[PDB]
């Protein structure tokens, strides 16, 4: 809700922040994303939909400090901003541009939707917000390189679930030609105060995941996070 | 690879002036460079990470600047302790790679060697073989002169020279040399002495012995 | 006490194979990233390898690619380096290094082992002979490198100099170890000198009376 003018506001507060995209002009990001879903029905959206968002978006970026997350959306926050050389997905244009924002268009007319839009697991997986994110989310593990950082919540109680957005996206595209090695930091939320939890069978998972993929799969804990930072 | 270039390759700075040692990057590392010292037989020492942070119980005196492709270390204030090898590293990606190194000498007065001269053991005659030693105790500067004479006779290409490292509590040099004779040599010849030339000797000056006295 | 102990020594024929090991202590070790850098005589510092805490993660210079590789048992607190196919050019002081970085990446070291000579050559080990005012020792014709000359099993520190060693033209090294002390000293004090060449396991102690 007041969602086009809170993009622009983004946008241009993002222009600001990084006089690397000053190169932007706003009304053509927000004039692309809105391309993306107006006027089509919200559960046809495609990926290519997306795709010049994509092109006004592709950020030149220190492809060997990504930091990947899956359920700690907060701490990897706190984290990218007193490791300030790593970045986040939210830490680019359009996931700054998007964050915690809802979205979603109407077949046959140029009307966008505050009444109600399609939730994912009730409605349809193809919405305009869903399929967003898994393509930004493919896009930046296909820019990763060298050692990718995944940062994972360690009480929740699949620490690696497949059908994570990380799961489901960002494994399968870290791209074996330019990853060498991806490595996970469990963080313990007071969960297993003493137990190794590398050690659990789904972060066995994801090892075994990453490494059909030749990309090398390493793990490490962090048992108090607070002096961690 | 990442090539870095630390541009004096020595120095010599007497105590108390601040040493100012460059390291040149081909390629941007940005920050990411970080200074060891390495003092004789050694590992390195962490001195500065990241360009401008001294690792834990490092000097004040110790501080590192720069970044993109040029970086400095400042010892601001030398001691005769701070004679090492220290070297530039960066981890701006793989491999990491480090500098040549400069090895910075600690400055003092003149120092003139004391000479001493040591015939061949017993036991190593009792074998076959005999070397005669010359030693030059601490003395700086480090350019010292020796010359082997046997019964008047200059030697060539038969000694070997050997310099210890800079003395890191005062600051002086020790040379060995060996000269090395079949016995057969050794026991047709009477006098051996070793003649020693440097710059705190008003005069060169001869230790010698007579074999069999 | 932050602590890091490499094991062994090395002389190797050359093509043949050895490995490195360094015991740390004071440090949760699975919790950094290791690495191997090596040191040639008289040259630089060239970095060889590096490790993951969970020792997943490798990385290695293209000189030792194929030939050397890394590796961890972090339950033994050690870092291991195989080395197969060793050249002359591999020859060097091998150096154990510890992350700073709370994370795999390029590294920087905050520690460091003491390091352990590799030597890569065809000849055979020799163990040495031994034979104000000055006293000392002639350590005289060994292989390889390194000696080790103590005074007095220790007590003698102030005043000695152990030179460096040179290579003779047969092929083996010799070095001498001097003491300056009091001329007067010369009939009061038991000056012994100890040498010990672990390549090949000669104590020799030898009193040097004048």
Redesign the interface.
Known sequence: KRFPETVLARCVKYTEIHPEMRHVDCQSVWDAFKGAFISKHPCNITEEDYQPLMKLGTQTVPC?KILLWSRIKDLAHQFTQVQRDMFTLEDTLLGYLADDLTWCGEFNTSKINYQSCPDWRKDCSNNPVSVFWKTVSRRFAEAAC??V?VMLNGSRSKIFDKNSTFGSVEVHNLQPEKV??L?A?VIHGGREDSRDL?QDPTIKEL?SIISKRNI??????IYRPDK?L | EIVLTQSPATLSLSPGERATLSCRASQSVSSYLAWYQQKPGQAPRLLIYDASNRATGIPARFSGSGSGTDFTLTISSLEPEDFAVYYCQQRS??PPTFGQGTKVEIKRTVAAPSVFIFPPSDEQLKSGTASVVCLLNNFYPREAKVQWKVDNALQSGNSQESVTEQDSKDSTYSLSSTLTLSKADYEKHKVYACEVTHQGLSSPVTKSFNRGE | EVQLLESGGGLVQPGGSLRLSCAVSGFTF??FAMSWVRQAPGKGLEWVSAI????????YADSVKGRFTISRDNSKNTLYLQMNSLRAEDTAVYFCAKDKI?????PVFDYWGQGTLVTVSSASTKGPSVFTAALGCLVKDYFPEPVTVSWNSGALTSGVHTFPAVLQSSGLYSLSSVVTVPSSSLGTQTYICNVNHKPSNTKVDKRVEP
């Open positions: 060997n060298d050692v950082h060498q090695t490595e930091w590398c090892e090398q799969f390493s793990c490490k804990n961690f | 990606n793989w | 699975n919790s993951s805490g969970s020792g997943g993660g490798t990385y709370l994370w795999f990446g390029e």
